[PDB]
């Protein structure tokens, strides 16, 4: 409120109101509304007593006509009133007056109110009487004057306009409603507690208090001095952090069960094939076409594989029906190759049972469930405990290598005029040079496009079965653009308005890897032998990996956001370069990547062979980082998040050990158990545990030297 008074009232009015409040022993800060009311009263009084003088004849015109008595100390105002009364031979009012009119030789009382002017006028007359004249103005453009000739039109209009402006300003600041009139100004903000809330308060106090009043008195009066020290002395000594100095010997391999050869090898569970993927390539002029037409054309080019109608089953996983999956695949091919333009499957009834949609339980009302003694709660399914698999390392090796085909294309940005955007452009050029052609980029683009198509078709259709090609656009060094078809998918009954229920997807994906070479990697895939190809004049078998999977709209959305891997893979590198650019003035991007006259190219330890670590260029580390991010996306679930979060602590402890910071651990087995509880069946988590153990051994050896 004080801001309002300062903005709308001069310092003199505020000082006078504060003095008046002090005379009555009223604190203006504790009662701001009363101070504001006094300020308004003073302002209106002084405004009324202006521009009015008495000529020699004694008539009003524009010696002053009005003499102000309000605003001065009580004693001085009383002296003024008594002197005026004695001089003019008029009866001295028993109550102090506000103004004095010489023309009428009378005492005038000025008042303000929020209600009707007449009511306040009557109240003031009753309180004081007719010994003094009564002018009353109200905030609602109404007033009551005992004599209408005392104030001309101009004065009353001016005071009314000022009051209206103040009212509007208060309403804007949400203070008018909070503001209370002089009748209620001698009060506060009333907030009484009821009965139920009072009882709830009474029954919500700590032990040792019978009611809330006792708690209030205790907190207000008693001072605690040594309560913490008093309680620590009598606390049992078993309550302790139990600190223990960390040493390289204390650190031990995480998840030793991953070396237990009795456990099954980790199976491949990614949504799509990544390193074993095969893509039928169709060269095109670059025109963008609907995915159905692209798939139709790619299949038409490879007519031998499309027309293959006699499957040669290679291995059926455990329960998948070979007939169901093969008939579903043939339906997919026929739908893609049909003259129509809709991608919906033409059976819609065989596909109901081929995908397993028809094998769903039937909901029943809760009463029958209560009465049926054989309806129990299914026990939780615990993820299998598996051991390290040799295919995750192979995938890491293969995905982080340059290929002849790049699927990463990005829009353009405005020209660069500042040097900063020039250095940014150079950094981007180097990054995309070392990331455009790596296979992880093609896999990421394929995943992104497939998930976009999945989400779009889920929105478009829910209760029918649709065909979605696994498609990519791939440009090679010469600038030729190929459309790559990696298979097809049947998206089934997506009766899923939410984002946390399963949508079935049967994926049939081309591949050239023999499933018999690594039988332990594909126990979830029913794979057929659909034909053979001549990639470069040499024959290569073409198998078809079939698998029934599930997704959620949230999973499709977050798959659409795999491209952020690129960002994650550049920020990192940028930071590295920045650090070097900080060590030496000039920009170190050129020096970091390929070196310069006075700086050799940067190298990073990438892997090992026969127990000896191997170094590689900055580009190789870049590709490794990008593949790491891509794998984090592909194999991301609760297990991976937990493992990464819990192993970050061990990584920081190892960093502290390296720098000789003398780290301590309050308990180490708890941290190890927290980390190891997440190593159950996620291929990336298990391979990461293996890699962490290997790196920890190398770090221990380095510490020895």
């Amino acid at each position: 409120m004080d801001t309002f008074i300062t903005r709308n009232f001069q310092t003199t009015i505020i000082q006078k109101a504060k003095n008046t409040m002090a005379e009555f022993s009223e604190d203006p800060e504790l009662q701001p509304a009363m101070l504001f009311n006094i300020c308004v009263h003073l302002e209106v009084c002084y405004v009324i007593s202006d521009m009015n003088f008495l000529d020699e004849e004694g008539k009003a015109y524009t010696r002053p006509q009005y003499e102000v008595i309000e605003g001065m100390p009580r004693t001085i105002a009383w002296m003024v009133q008594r002197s005026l009364a004695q001089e003019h031979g008029i009866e001295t009012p028993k109550y102090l007056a506000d103004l004095f009119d010489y023309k009428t030789k009378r005492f005038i009382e000025v008042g303000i109110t929020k209600g009707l002017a007449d009511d306040y006028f009557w109240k003031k007359k009753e309180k004081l009487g007719n010994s003094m004249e009564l002018m009353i103005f109200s905030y609602n453009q109404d007033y009551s004057l005992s004599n209408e000739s005392s104030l001309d039109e101009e004065g009353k209009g001016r005071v009314l306009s000022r009051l209206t402006e103040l009212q509007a300003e208060l309403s804007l600041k949400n203070l008018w409603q909070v503001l209370i009139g002089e009748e209620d100004v001698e009060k506060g903000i009333d907030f009484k507690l009821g009965q139920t809330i009072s009882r709830l308060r009474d029954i919500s106090v700590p032990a040792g208090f019978s009611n809330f009043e006792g708690m209030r008195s205790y907190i207000d009066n008693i001072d605690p001095k040594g309560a913490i020290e008093r309680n620590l002395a009598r606390m049992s000594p078993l309550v302790s952090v139990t600190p223990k100095k960390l040493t390289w010997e204390d650190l031990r391999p995480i998840g030793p069960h991953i070396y237990n050869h009795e456990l099954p090898e980790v199976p491949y569970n990614a949504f799509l094939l990544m390193s074993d993927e095969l893509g039928l390539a169709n060269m095109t002029e670059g025109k963008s076409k609907k995915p159905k037409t692209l798939a139709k054309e790619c299949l038409e080019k490879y007519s031998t594989l499309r027309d293959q109608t006699d499957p040669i089953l290679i291995m059926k996983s455990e329960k998948a029906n070979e007939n169901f999956l093969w008939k579903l695949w043939r339906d997919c091919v026929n739908t893609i190759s049909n003259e129509e333009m809709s991608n919906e499957l033409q059976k819609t009834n065989y596909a109901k049972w081929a995908t397993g949609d028809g094998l769903t339980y039937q909901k029943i009302m809760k009463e029958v469930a209560i009465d049926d003694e054989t309806m129990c709660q299914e026990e939780p399914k615990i993820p299998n405990k598996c051991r390290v698999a040799a295919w995750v390392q192979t995938e890491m090796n293969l995905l982080s290598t340059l290929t002849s085909k790049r699927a990463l294309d990005l829009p353009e940005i405005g020209p660069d005029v500042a040097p900063v955007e020039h250095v940014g452009s150079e950094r981007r050029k180097y990054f995309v040079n070392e990331i455009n052609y790596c296979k992880a980029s093609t896999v990421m683009m394929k995943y992104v496009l497939f998930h976009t198509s999945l989400l779009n078709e889920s929105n478009a259709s829910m209760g029918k079965y649709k065909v979605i090609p696994i498609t990519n656009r791939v440009v090679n060094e010469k600038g030729e653009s190929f459309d790559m078809l990696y298979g097809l998918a049947v998206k089934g009954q997506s009766h899923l308005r939410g984002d946390t229920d399963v949508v079935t997807v049967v994926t049939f994906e081309f591949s050239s890897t023999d499933p018999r070479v690594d039988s332990g990697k594909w126990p979830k895939y029913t794979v057929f032998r659909i034909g053979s190809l001549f990639v470069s004049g040499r024959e290569k078998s073409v198998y078809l990996y079939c698998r029934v999977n599930g997704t959620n709209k949230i999973q499709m959305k977050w798959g659409m956001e795999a491209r952020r891997c690129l960002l994650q893979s550049m920020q990192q590198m940028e930071a590295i370069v920045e650090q070097e650019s900080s060590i030496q003035g000039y920009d170190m991007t050129k020096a970091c990547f390929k070196g310069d006259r006075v700086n050799s190219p940067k190298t990073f330890s990438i892997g090992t062979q026969e127990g000896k670590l191997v170094k590689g260029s900055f580009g190789k580390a870049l590709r490794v980082i990008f593949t790491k991010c891509l794998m984090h996306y592909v194999f991301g679930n609760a297990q991976l998040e937990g493992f990464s979060a819990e192993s970050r602590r061990l990584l920081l402890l190892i960093q502290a050990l390296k720098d000789r910071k003398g780290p301590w651990v309050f308990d180490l087995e708890g941290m190890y158990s927290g980390i190891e509880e997440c190593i159950s069946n996620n291929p990336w988590v298990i391979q990461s545990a293996y890699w962490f153990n290997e790196w920890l051994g190398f770090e221990k050896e380095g510490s020895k030297v």
Partner: protein
């Protein structure tokens, strides 16, 4: 191990760990001693003269001005009328409407104090009438409003009840947890108490004003430098990277009631009572339990969900072992209506500032027994970092042990599995890693650089502003920002089917874009939404592309795009122009189709239509809106009649209608 009793108000089973036995093991303990908490708060007051009084006065003054509509801000709130989760505005207006049926007209008074007074009063009414959604099968399921009633006890249970769900998208945790939302009865009081706590904690140097952006780096660097400077000659400074998990389950609302009472030691009793209501309603809270369990028989291929009110209607032998044990242990605190009383502990996100104040109070002890070590640290919302300066590692570990034990006395538990220690100079706080003066905050996921999905112009402005803000705050480098621009432009072109006119893409809009590509001579002036080339770079991320391309626009293209009277713009679609992005009005400024609600909607729409100023600034007046509407309509009709914009019959009809309203 505390005190178990029965709540007479509600009949629930209440547990009171406060002032209980001291812990004898290293398991989490809620047995916070009141005297120790008061000791910590008194120390905090001593080190900060008049901070409690200043915060209390500021909170009171802000409360006096706050209005009921302030409760419309926030997230989904529990609605007792429907016992569901509904937006804040929906719950607030439903409660205001149902309070009118009960003769509780505090909402019409404006300010928040009268509305909260009526909320408190509603707990006393012997019954409680409201409007409930009832579905009739007429076959169509038609929902409608029905005047339903609930006795006092059920209403109290609903008001104290806290709806629950499973937290979603909580990265870094293997298992999930329970997140909760409260109703409107506790929203205002929680708001005031949180304002008080924030006022206190902004001054505290340990917590600091809740820092955003790169102020976290400054806080970490200042803390490390200050502690290292304070380190005695030849001594050692050790930093403990700490982490409390499920630390809100050992925080008692009774302790927070004590803190609110201590903080407001010198304040009017009305504000002291007002600030004491959120802890009171949190100490007697009721936890609604999910949606039940699902039981299936596979020999019959049948499944059925068991609603939580009927959890124990089935023999426990028909649940799995973990659920069996859970229900067996839950039985004592199970309520017949399908809820469980949860007196001790606190759900996440309710009292964050207050809990931070408690943590900073724990930090500010700084020593125990005049030992040879000084500890100080940073605290923020369950995450703390400690620093101990002493003369040797043994004394530093003694100080860390003393801090652990002291925190045990306040109900604060620190995870020994998640907490570690090392020499000062390398640690982590709020997922921000400091090492040798270098801070490496890398846990804030960069938001997906895609269109905000409001409209073309606004989306482009929002995306560019977001990239620039990331550069300014989150230390985004040049190249990363340029790649972010590229990705955003790709997503923008994909969403709005706006590819370069020279591209070979096909589509409904792309045909017209291709036509415009050649019909327009100046090609670099087109907006990207019209197939134009992107010209955004690091330097010009703060200038709208409408302005950026104004000089290169063709004479007719700017006129068409900037045609003052074009059909793709409506006044009522401008509400969201502010919320902040800078853009321009044009053909790309359209809005989306719409997928006592309609009463208020249409009344306010008419109010804004009659007076275009009400949309921008709050109107001022001390009279009904109806009379002002009538008067302004009379003035408008007279002006139109004078200017020839209206006929005699039209003005006569307008006056007849106004008289029908009753303002002639």
């Amino acid at each position: 191990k505390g005190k178990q009793y029965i709540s007479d108000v509600t009949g629930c089973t209440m547990v009171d760990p406060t002032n209980g036995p001291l812990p004898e093991d290293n398991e989490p303990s809620a047995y916070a001693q009141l005297d120790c908490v008061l000791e910590a708060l008194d120390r905090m007051d001593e080190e900060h003269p008049g901070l409690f009084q200043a915060a209390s006065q500021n909170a009171m003054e802000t409360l006096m001005v706050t209005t009921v509509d302030k409760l419309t801000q926030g997230r989904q709130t529990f609605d007792w009328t429907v016992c569901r989760n509904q937006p804040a505005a929906t719950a607030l207006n439903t409660t205001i409407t149902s309070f009118r049926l009960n003769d509780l007209n505090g909402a019409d008074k404006g300010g928040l104090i009268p509305f909260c007074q009526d909320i408190i009063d509603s707990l006393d009414r012997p019954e409680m009438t409201f409007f409930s959604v009832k579905n009739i099968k007429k076959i169509k399921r038609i929902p409608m409003k029905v005047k339903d009633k609930i006795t006092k006890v059920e209403y109290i249970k609903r008001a104290l009840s806290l709806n629950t769900m499973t937290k979603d998208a909580e990265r870094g945790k293997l298992k999930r947890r329970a997140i909760a939302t409260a109703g409107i009865q506790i929203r205002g009081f929680v708001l005031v108490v949180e304002n008080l706590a924030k006022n206190i904690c902004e001054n505290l140097e340990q917590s600091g004003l809740p820092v955003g952006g790169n102020e976290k780096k400054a806080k970490l660097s200042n803390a490390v430098a200050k502690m290292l400077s304070n380190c005695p000659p030849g001594g050692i400074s050790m930093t403990v990277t700490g982490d409390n998990t499920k630390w809100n389950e050992c925080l008692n609302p009774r302790i927070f009631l004590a803190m609110t009472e201590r903080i407001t030691r010198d304040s009017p009793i009305w504000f002291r009572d007002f600030c004491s209501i959120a802890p009171v309603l949190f100490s007697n809270k009721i936890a609604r339990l999910g949606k039940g369990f699902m039981i299936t028989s596979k020999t019959k291929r049948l499944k059925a969900q068991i609603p939580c009110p009927d959890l124990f209607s089935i023999p426990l032998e028909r649940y799995n072992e973990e659920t069996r044990a859970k229900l067996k242990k839950l039985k004592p605190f199970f309520n017949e209506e399908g809820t469980a009383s949860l007196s001790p502990g606190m759900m996440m996100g309710m009292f964050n500032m207050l809990s931070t104040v408690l943590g900073v109070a724990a930090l500010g002890i700084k020593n125990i027994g005049n030992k040879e070590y000084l500890w100080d640290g940073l605290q923020s919302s369950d995450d703390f970092a400690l620093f101990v300066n002493a003369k040797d590692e043994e004394t530093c570990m003694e100080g860390i042990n003393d801090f652990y034990r002291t925190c045990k006395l306040l109900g604060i538990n620190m995870s020994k599995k998640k907490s570690y220690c090392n020499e000062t100079g390398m640690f982590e706080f709020t997922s921000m890693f400091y090492r040798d003066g270098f801070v490496s905050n890398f846990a804030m996921e960069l938001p997906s650089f895609g269109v905000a999905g409001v409209n073309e112009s606004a989306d482009m402005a929002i995306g560019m502003t977001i990239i620039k803000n990331n550069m300014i705050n989150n230390g985004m480098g040049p190249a990363t920002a340029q790649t972010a621009i590229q990705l955003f432009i790709a997503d923008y072109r994909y969403t709005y089917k706006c590819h370069r006119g020279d591209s070979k893409v096909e589509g409904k809009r792309m045909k017209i874009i291709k036509e415009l590509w050649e019909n327009t001579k100046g090609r670099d002036g087109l907006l990207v939404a019209d197939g134009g080339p992107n010209i955004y770079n690091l330097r010009n991320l703060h200038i709208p592309e409408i302005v950026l391309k104004y000089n290169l626009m063709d004479p007719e293209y700017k006129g068409r795009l900037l045609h003052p009277q074009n059909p793709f713009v409506g006044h009522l679609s401008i509400e969201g122009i502010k919320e902040d992005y800078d853009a321009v009005s044009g053909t790309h400024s359209w809005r989306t189709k719409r997928n006592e609600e309609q009463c208020y909607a249409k009344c306010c729409n008419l109010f804004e239509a009659c007076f275009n100023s009400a949309s921008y600034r709050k109107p001022v007046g001390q009279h009904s809106m109806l009379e002002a509407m009538a008067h302004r309509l009379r003035m408008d009709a007279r002006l139109d009649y004078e200017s020839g914009r209206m006929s005699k019959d039209d003005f006569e009809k307008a006056m007849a209608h106004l008289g029908e309203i009753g303002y002639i």
